[PDB]
Amino acid sequence: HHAADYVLYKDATKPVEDRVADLLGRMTLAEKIGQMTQIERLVATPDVLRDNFIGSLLSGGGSVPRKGATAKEWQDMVDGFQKACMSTRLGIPMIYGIDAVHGQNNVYGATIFPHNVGLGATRDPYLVKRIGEATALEVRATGIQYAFAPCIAVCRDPRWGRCYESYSEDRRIVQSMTELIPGLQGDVPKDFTSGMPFVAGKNKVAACAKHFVGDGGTVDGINENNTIINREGLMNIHMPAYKNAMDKGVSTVMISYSSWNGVKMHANQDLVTGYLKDTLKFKGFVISDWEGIDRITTPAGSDYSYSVKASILAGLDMIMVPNKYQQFISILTGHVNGGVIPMSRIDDAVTRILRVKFTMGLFENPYADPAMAEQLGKQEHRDLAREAARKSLVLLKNGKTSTDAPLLPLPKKAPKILVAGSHADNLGYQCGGWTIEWQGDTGRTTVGTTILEAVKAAVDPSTVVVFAENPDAEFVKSGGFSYAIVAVGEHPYTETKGDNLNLTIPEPGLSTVQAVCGGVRCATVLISGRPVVVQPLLAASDALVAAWLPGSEGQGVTDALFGDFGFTGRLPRTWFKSVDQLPMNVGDAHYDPLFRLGYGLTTNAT
Ligand SMILES: OC[C@H]1O[C@@H](S[C@H]2[C@H](O)[C@@H](O)[C@H](O[C@H]3[C@H](O)[C@@H](O)[C@H](S)O[C@@H]3CO)O[C@@H]2CO)[C@H](O)[C@@H](O)[C@@H]1O
């Protein structure tokens, strides 16, 4: 179809399957194994990418071209890597992936949305779809084509350090929030076949349903550990949202570090091939987690040859190496040359990776669009995040007795008010993990509005706002305050650092709430990724709001505190009385919550 050097795979008018087949039939083994290899930007160079025919790059958490880098700097990085891939014999574009899990969260000046637990509180799948839409734009602002989201874990024990990444303990809520996928990727057409991958084009990103499967089921919420549950319960709790993701054309699936009844997921042929591929008919590509094949063995990394064999034979398509790429390629090449891994398995992996690349338009638009840089941090997206933050808030108490005046909503005009607590003026704490750094960080780490700044923006000009991080009781009682807003809670964490058997917030937190509430009527805003021991905070407070990890737009908190909007959020998880109850979910015999799933008080807008 027409010039003498026509190559069908380069013809954008041709069907995806024809282009895939045409390309695959041209590739050497080294080209094929290169497609299967994802490396960290930190080990990438132009020569590395060309010589090893690399298929994909990622930024792990905190892996950035420099601190404070602009959108244009990200595009220039990504395009520099792409130029090297495009210079190979076959010119196959790389796909660049990142954890854009509550916005484009590694990037300075990106809108940071509430973490998933708060989004579960909203019970609003359309809101979540819009968040997906905005997030795709902000990822494409930085030149990135692929986001490692959504996390569709159903967290069954809040002692898990990734509980905040789960929309709920109730899989129906998780299933509903799979609407993130067509936000990020675009809506699938009416005719669509479930399990096929889909991305609408260059203003959308490939998505990733993660982590397959039972990541939120692990014993004692120990991260990466064993999920002990029969097949009926795996299928009833942990699996259903994967079906919803297939119906919405999710492009990729990332495998869990966890084990199901003692078998590592990264080595689980029955589930990865037998179930996801052969029963759900998934036709996108399956990616490992970070050194996930290494962690098949104990100790991790102790037989990388076996890790390669076991994972590829299990049915993984792309391996997030992410550093030891020479070793990886060398080992897989030797297994193929030895007949230990059949070429059919290699060709299936490559078919899937190429299918996603062609489908999304990556061959037509391999490079960044500089006109998209202005999407990063856009005020429209911030307004969305502010709506989401406000809808996520769950009002747990609004008066000490049944006869007291409701504290909330607070009046915006008062002579003098106090804002206090470790979390009142700390943007990093309000965002939590996966924000700028992998683990999150403390203080003013990006562009956003703290609780204190939001109060100052909201109140009448005649209201004097005093900030004291940790005032003593006598300071509050002598201060002449009309009321206080006190914000306290968890510090940022991710993954294993967040695994926590006591679930008691750090001090000073409770001591500050007791000092403040002791001197003036107080509204306590609890910042956490999960339920935490709360009876003492409740005892001290006139009003208490569970604000989860609301992100960069702290005006979402004050929009409810001052009554511009009513409180509508409802608990997406059970709030335990004691950590000795755990795990404790609905249907259990010992179900005795402090607050049940679905609990939340309301107010009306003033
Ligand atoms: O990010 C891609 C997928 O990765 C894991 S999280 C992953 C972080 O992205 C990464 O920065 C981090 O690196 C640490 C290594 O694990 C350690 O071996 C060394 S000692 O220290 C570095 C410090 O950064 O590793 C993390 C996993 O351990 C998630 O599970 C996926 O959801 C995510 O999409």
Author numbering: -3 to 602
What does the study report here?
In the barley β-d-glucan glucohydrolase, a glycoside hydrolase family 3 (GH3) enzyme, the Trp286/Trp434 clamp ensures β-d-glucosides binding, which is fundamental for substrate hydrolysis during plant growth and development. HvExoI folds into a two-domain structure consisting of an (α/β)8 barrel (domain 1) and an (α/β)6 sandwich (domain 2) with a 13 Å-deep active site pocket embracing the subsites −1 and +1, positioned at the interface between the two domains. HvExoI catalyses the hydrolytic removal of nonreducing glucose (Glc) moiety from a broad spectrum of poly- and oligomeric β-d-glucosides. The crucial role of substrate binding in HvExoI implies a pair of the aromatic Trp286 and Trp434 residues that form a clamp at the +1 subsite, which is positioned next to a pocket-shaped site at the −1 subsite, housing the Asp285 and Glu491 catalysts.
G4SG-OMe bound to native and WT recombinant HvExoI with the Ki values of 1.0 ×10−3 M. The β-d-glucopyranose rings of thio-saccharide analogues at the −1 subsites in the WT crystal structure complexes were engaged in H-bond networks and observed in the 4C1 conformation for G2SG-OMe and G6SG-OMe, the 4H3 conformation for 4NP-G3SG, and the 4E/4H3 conformations for G4SG4OG, while the β-d-glucopyranose moieties of thio-ligands at the +1 subsites adopted the 4C1 conformation. In these WT complexes, the Glc moiety at the −1 subsite was oriented almost identically, contrary to the Glc moiety at the +1 subsite that adopted various orientations. The complex with G4OG3OG was generated based on the WT HvExoI:G4SG4OG complex, upon replacing G4 with G3.
